[PDB]
Each structure stands twice: as structure tokens, then as C-alpha cells.
Design an enzyme around this catalytic site. Structure first.
Site, mmCIF file in Angstrom:
data_model
loop_
_atom_site.group_PDB
_atom_site.id
_atom_site.type_symbol
_atom_site.label_atom_id
_atom_site.label_comp_id
_atom_site.label_asym_id
_atom_site.label_seq_id
_atom_site.Cartn_x
_atom_site.Cartn_y
_atom_site.Cartn_z
ATOM 1 N N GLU A 49 4.456 -45.799 8.243
ATOM 2 C CA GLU A 49 5.623 -44.985 8.589
ATOM 3 C C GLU A 49 6.562 -45.733 9.527
ATOM 4 O O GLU A 49 6.113 -46.523 10.356
ATOM 5 C CB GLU A 49 5.202 -43.650 9.213
ATOM 6 C CG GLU A 49 4.562 -42.653 8.236
ATOM 7 C CD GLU A 49 5.349 -42.490 6.942
ATOM 8 O OE1 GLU A 49 4.715 -42.527 5.865
ATOM 9 O OE2 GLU A 49 6.594 -42.347 6.992
ATOM 10 N N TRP A 50 7.864 -45.473 9.391
ATOM 11 C CA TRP A 50 8.885 -46.163 10.185
ATOM 12 C C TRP A 50 8.606 -46.098 11.693
ATOM 13 O O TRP A 50 8.853 -47.061 12.414
ATOM 14 C CB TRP A 50 10.281 -45.611 9.871
ATOM 15 C CG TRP A 50 10.571 -44.297 10.538
ATOM 16 C CD1 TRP A 50 10.199 -43.056 10.107
ATOM 17 C CD2 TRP A 50 11.274 -44.101 11.771
ATOM 18 N NE1 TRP A 50 10.641 -42.095 10.990
ATOM 19 C CE2 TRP A 50 11.302 -42.711 12.021
ATOM 20 C CE3 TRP A 50 11.887 -44.964 12.686
ATOM 21 C CZ2 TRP A 50 11.920 -42.167 13.147
ATOM 22 C CZ3 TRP A 50 12.504 -44.421 13.804
ATOM 23 C CH2 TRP A 50 12.514 -43.036 14.024
ATOM 24 N N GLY A 77 -6.685 -45.152 2.229
ATOM 25 C CA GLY A 77 -6.323 -43.844 1.695
ATOM 26 C C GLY A 77 -6.350 -43.834 0.179
ATOM 27 O O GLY A 77 -6.605 -44.865 -0.449
ATOM 28 N N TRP A 78 -6.081 -42.667 -0.403
ATOM 29 C CA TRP A 78 -6.126 -42.471 -1.856
ATOM 30 C C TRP A 78 -4.975 -43.178 -2.576
ATOM 31 O O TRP A 78 -5.197 -43.864 -3.576
ATOM 32 C CB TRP A 78 -6.142 -40.973 -2.192
ATOM 33 C CG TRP A 78 -6.240 -40.659 -3.665
ATOM 34 C CD1 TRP A 78 -5.215 -40.307 -4.495
ATOM 35 C CD2 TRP A 78 -7.426 -40.665 -4.473
ATOM 36 N NE1 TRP A 78 -5.685 -40.097 -5.770
ATOM 37 C CE2 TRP A 78 -7.039 -40.309 -5.785
ATOM 38 C CE3 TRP A 78 -8.777 -40.942 -4.219
ATOM 39 C CZ2 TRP A 78 -7.954 -40.217 -6.839
ATOM 40 C CZ3 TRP A 78 -9.688 -40.849 -5.267
ATOM 41 C CH2 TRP A 78 -9.270 -40.490 -6.560
ATOM 42 N N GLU A 119 -10.996 -46.518 -1.224
ATOM 43 C CA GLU A 119 -11.421 -45.554 -2.234
ATOM 44 C C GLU A 119 -11.255 -46.078 -3.669
ATOM 45 O O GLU A 119 -10.177 -45.960 -4.247
ATOM 46 C CB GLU A 119 -10.686 -44.218 -2.046
ATOM 47 C CG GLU A 119 -11.005 -43.513 -0.729
ATOM 48 C CD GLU A 119 -10.242 -42.207 -0.534
ATOM 49 O OE1 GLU A 119 -9.801 -41.594 -1.525
ATOM 50 O OE2 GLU A 119 -10.088 -41.783 0.625
ATOM 51 N N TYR A 120 -12.297 -46.681 -4.246
ATOM 52 C CA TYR A 120 -13.558 -47.026 -3.576
ATOM 53 C C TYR A 120 -13.942 -48.449 -4.003
ATOM 54 O O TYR A 120 -13.411 -48.947 -4.996
ATOM 55 C CB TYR A 120 -14.684 -46.065 -3.990
ATOM 56 C CG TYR A 120 -14.400 -44.597 -3.755
ATOM 57 C CD1 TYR A 120 -13.992 -43.773 -4.804
ATOM 58 C CD2 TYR A 120 -14.545 -44.030 -2.488
ATOM 59 C CE1 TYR A 120 -13.732 -42.425 -4.600
ATOM 60 C CE2 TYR A 120 -14.276 -42.680 -2.271
ATOM 61 C CZ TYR A 120 -13.876 -41.885 -3.335
ATOM 62 O OH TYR A 120 -13.618 -40.550 -3.136
ATOM 63 N N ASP A 192 -13.539 -32.105 -1.678
ATOM 64 C CA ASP A 192 -13.022 -32.341 -3.036
ATOM 65 C C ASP A 192 -14.174 -32.399 -4.041
ATOM 66 O O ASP A 192 -14.094 -33.093 -5.062
ATOM 67 C CB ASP A 192 -12.177 -33.624 -3.123
ATOM 68 C CG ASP A 192 -11.027 -33.651 -2.138
ATOM 69 O OD1 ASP A 192 -10.444 -32.590 -1.830
ATOM 70 O OD2 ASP A 192 -10.698 -34.763 -1.671
ATOM 71 N N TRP A 339 -11.289 -33.372 8.246
ATOM 72 C CA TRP A 339 -10.013 -33.588 7.564
ATOM 73 C C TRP A 339 -9.301 -32.246 7.343
ATOM 74 O O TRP A 339 -9.768 -31.440 6.549
ATOM 75 C CB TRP A 339 -10.202 -34.301 6.216
ATOM 76 C CG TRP A 339 -8.890 -34.775 5.661
ATOM 77 C CD1 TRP A 339 -7.943 -34.020 5.020
ATOM 78 C CD2 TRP A 339 -8.356 -36.098 5.744
ATOM 79 N NE1 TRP A 339 -6.862 -34.797 4.688
ATOM 80 C CE2 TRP A 339 -7.086 -36.077 5.122
ATOM 81 C CE3 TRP A 339 -8.827 -37.303 6.283
ATOM 82 C CZ2 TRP A 339 -6.284 -37.213 5.023
ATOM 83 C CZ3 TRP A 339 -8.028 -38.433 6.184
ATOM 84 C CH2 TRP A 339 -6.773 -38.382 5.556
HETATM 85 N N1 LIG Z 1 -9.520 -38.821 0.727
HETATM 86 C C1 LIG Z 1 -9.139 -38.167 -0.452
HETATM 87 N N2 LIG Z 1 -9.499 -38.806 -1.643
HETATM 88 N N3 LIG Z 1 -8.651 -36.830 -0.447
HETATM 89 C C2 LIG Z 1 -9.036 -35.847 0.614
HETATM 90 C C3 LIG Z 1 -7.809 -35.345 1.367
HETATM 91 N N4 LIG Z 1 -6.756 -34.865 0.455
HETATM 92 C C4 LIG Z 1 -5.791 -33.998 0.970
HETATM 93 C C5 LIG Z 1 -4.402 -34.226 0.794
HETATM 94 C C6 LIG Z 1 -3.421 -33.369 1.316
HETATM 95 C C7 LIG Z 1 -3.810 -32.247 2.045
HETATM 96 CL CL1 LIG Z 1 -2.623 -31.178 2.691
HETATM 97 C C8 LIG Z 1 -5.161 -31.985 2.248
HETATM 98 C C9 LIG Z 1 -6.134 -32.850 1.719
HETATM 99 C C10 LIG Z 1 -6.343 -35.863 -0.554
HETATM 100 C C11 LIG Z 1 -7.542 -36.389 -1.351
#
Ligand SMILES: N=C(N)N1CCN(c2ccc(Cl)cc2)CC1
Length: 377
Positions: A49-50, A77-78, A119-120, A192, A339
């Protein structure tokens, strides 16, 4: 027990009461705070981010209000994918380039460690050699961290990892006994576990299996996943259980069929704050309930759900977090990770259960309510 809370640098872009900055964090709430996310350029850690640098200062400045607080920077991250990680671990030269940049980056901006969110390894484009090369990277990082700490006479930087909950992802991604030796904490992403991609209603983070869970579906619960990690080489004291402050919503194919395993036609509506298709923040779920949604309880899995019209949501609440916390203690794991901090009802105006009702439930249950919270001298 540890209470580790993830903060996201895109929560700042949410409208109105949804906007969350580092200064919205209660410094006395969690034992560890993790910043998501950092990126990579030319095998070196970078910002995304900026205004990341400004936010690092405010994020890490929280330690000025809690002497016990530790902070980490999560890389990946994803959306980041596997590609930059693959290229980085592929040669010893690139790994050294990365580790060097990490040491300089974390010390410069005052983070206490690095959290790997690759991941992953071994999946999503990542070739099979990455499973072992990830272990190599982690080992090399840990050892570099140990040497650096002695040369500058400061506490050692921590190295941690967010890791898969899916058994196939685990099996092709991690050398558990070896990897467990070098990681300080293992952040298991026990969420998830179900979602709209499946074609029927299911829970985001069920504690136990549902009676209809047959074959490989019997693995899609917190208890099985955490015990899998433990039985396959990870010390329980290093294992950190993943707690979601969000749920997954669905469009019900038949509005009169509202139980677990009900057929769905796609992801549920984006919330008015997070604006994530198929995902509602806990405080967005509270709105759903206040506007007349029917409260359901998934008794075998110890988790709530809710429905109204053709919208069905599976999630976690105060009760389920409390049940999971007592389970965690009985199983003697290292603690809990969350999370995400910005997805809990931080204002308290949505759920009327106090500020940070979900994370406060964990703070209390894990015996942290009386833990020292004083500014450093
Ligand atoms: N680490 C990941 N693969 N995921 C877990 C967190 N995920 C997520 C994304 C947006 C919101 Cl608001 C809440 C949860 C995105 C997919």
C-alpha cells in the site's frame, strides 16, 4: 496461551464505521499482532500500500503502550500467489537476497518477526520441489535470525508461518517434523473449510464433523486438522488454532431448505462494509441478525448459522469462540490466532456485545484478562 491477531492494510479503504487503522487496535487485546500484507520485488521484501510505512510506524508504535506486545509482518497472501515465492527459493542466491532484505526491513520498521503466508508450497502453480525448499528457506531464515541477534545484541526476530488446513494442501506443501523445528509458531488456517465453491451450505470453521461428512469431507473441521498437524510432527505448544471473525454466505437454491448441506446457487451478497462476495464480517452478520434473520445453531459442529429469504450464512459467534477456546485448552495447543482484528465488532455498535466481542471472548477464555499492560520505560 498466545492470542495472535491479524491486521489488514486494506481495511483502511472501507466506508464509514468499517474503516480500520492500526490506531483502532486495542494494544492490550492481543499478545501478538501481525501486519498483512508485505510483498516482494526482485527477491526482496517490499511494501504494498502507498502508505504502508506510515502505518508500520503506527502499528509498531502500539508496543509503546504495551511492553509485552510483539509484532510481525506477514508476506504473501492469496492474491500474491506462489510465483514470487517459487522464484525466490529456487536458488540459494535468491534466498540469501531475500533473508538479507527481511532482516534489514524488519529492523528498520521495528517488527519483531516475519510471518510466511505462502499459499501454498507444492500447489496453486508452485512445483513439487517447493515443499522441501520451503523448509530450507525457513531453516536458513531462522539460522540467519539467530546469528543477527547475537551480532547486534538484540532479541531474536521470530519466524512463523500461516499454513494450510486442507489435507491435500498439507501433504504436498509441508515437511511437518523438519519445518516444526525452525518455526517459532505455526498458524493453522482452520477456516474457509466450507464455502459456496462447494454447491451447498456448510460452515466456515466447524469444530467437529457433521454426521453427513463422509470420506475426505470428514477432514473439514478444526479438531481433525489441528490433530493432523500434531500427529504428523508438529509440537502442540507451537500450534496456533485459526479463529475467523467472518463467515461465508450463500444464495439458497430453495429458501425453504435452510439446514446444513442445503443446495446453493452461488456466493452470498457482499456486505456493505467489507464488500466481499461470499463473505460477511462478524459485525455485518450482526446487522443481518438485527434486520430479522433466523438464528440457527449447528449443534454437532458447535457453530452458529443464520438465514433470511434466499441468504444463508455460516459463521462464528461469542458462544462458538468460547467452546473452541475450552477445546483448545483441553488439547493444550499453543494458543489462538485471529483473522482478522478489523472484522470483529471493534466499535461495538453493531453487535452490542462490547468492543471486540469475539477477540475479548478469547482473551478471557485463554486467561489473559489480568495480563500486564503497561507502557515500556
Ligand atoms: N488466507 C485465505 N486464503 N483466505 C482467508 C481470508 N479471506 C478473507 C478475505 C476477506 C474478508 Cl473480509 C475476510 C476473509 C480470504 C481467503
Amino acid at each position: 496461551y498466545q492470542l495472535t491477531c491479524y491486521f489488514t492494510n486494506w481495511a483502511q479503504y472501507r466506508p464509514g464505521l468499517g474503516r480500520f487503522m492500526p490506531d483502532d487496535i486495542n494494544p492490550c487485546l492481543c499478545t501478538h499482532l501481525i501486519y498483512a500484507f508485505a510483498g516482494m520485488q526482485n527477491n526482496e521484501i517490499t511494501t504494498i500500500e502507498w502508505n504502508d510505512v506510515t502505518l508500520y510506524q503506527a502499528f509498531n508504535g502500539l508496543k509503546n503502550k504495551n511492553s509485552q506486545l510483539k509484532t510481525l509482518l506477514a508476506i504473501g497472501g492469496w492474491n500474491f500467489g506462489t510465483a514470487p515465492f517459487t522464484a525466490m527459493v529456487s536458488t540459494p542466491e535468491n534466498r540469501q537476497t531475500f533473508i538479507t532484505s527481511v532482516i534489514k526491513f524488519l529492523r528498520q520498521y521495528e517488527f519483531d518477526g516475519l510471518d510466511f503466508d505462502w499459499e501454498y508450497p507444492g500447489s496453486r502453480g508452485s512445483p513439487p520441489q517447493d515443499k522441501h525448499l520451503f523448509t530450507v528457506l525457513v531453516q536458513e531464515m531462522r539460522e540467519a535470525f539467530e546469528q543477527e541477534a547475537k551480532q547486534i545484541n538484540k532479541p531474536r526476530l521470530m519466524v512463523t508461518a500461516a499454513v494450510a488446513a486442507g489435507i491435500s494442501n498439507i501433504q504436498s506443501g509441508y515437511e511437518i517434523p523438519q519445518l516444526s523445528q525452525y518455526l517459532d509458531y505455526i498458524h493453522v488456517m482452520t477456516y474457509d473449510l466450507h464455502g459456496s465453491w462447494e454447491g451447498y451450505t456448510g460452515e466456515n470453521s466447524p469444530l467437529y464433523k457433521y454426521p453427513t461428512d463422509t470420506g475426505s469431507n470428514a477432514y473439514l473441521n478444526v479438531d481433525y486438522v489441528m490433530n493432523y498437524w500434531k500427529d504428523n510432527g508438529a509440537p502442540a505448544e507451537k500450534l496456533i488454532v485459526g479463529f475467523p471473525t467472518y463467515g461465508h454466505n450463500f444464495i439458497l437454491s430453495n429458501p425453504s431448505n435452510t439446514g446444513i448441506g442445503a443446495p446453493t446457487s452461488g456466493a452470498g451478497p457482499a456486505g456493505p462494509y467489507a464488500k466481499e462476495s461470499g463473505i460477511w464480517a462478524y459485525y455485518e452478520i450482526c446487522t443481518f441478525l438485527k434486520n430479522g434473520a433466523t438464528q440457527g445453531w449447528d449443534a454437532p459442529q458447535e457453530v452458529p448459522y443464520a438465514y433470511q429469504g434466499n441468504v444463508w450464512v455460516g459463521y462464528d459467534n461469542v458462544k462458538s469462540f468460547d467452546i473452541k477456546a475450552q477445546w483448545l485448552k483441553h488439547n493444550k495447543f499453543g494458543g489462538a490466532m485471529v483473522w482478522a482484528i478489523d472484522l470483529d465488532d471493534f466499535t461495538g455498535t453493531f453487535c452490542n456485545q462490547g468492543k471486540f466481542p469475539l477477540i475479548s471472548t478469547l482473551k478471557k477464555a485463554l486467561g489473559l484478562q489480568s495480563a500486564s499492560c503497561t507502557a515500556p520505560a
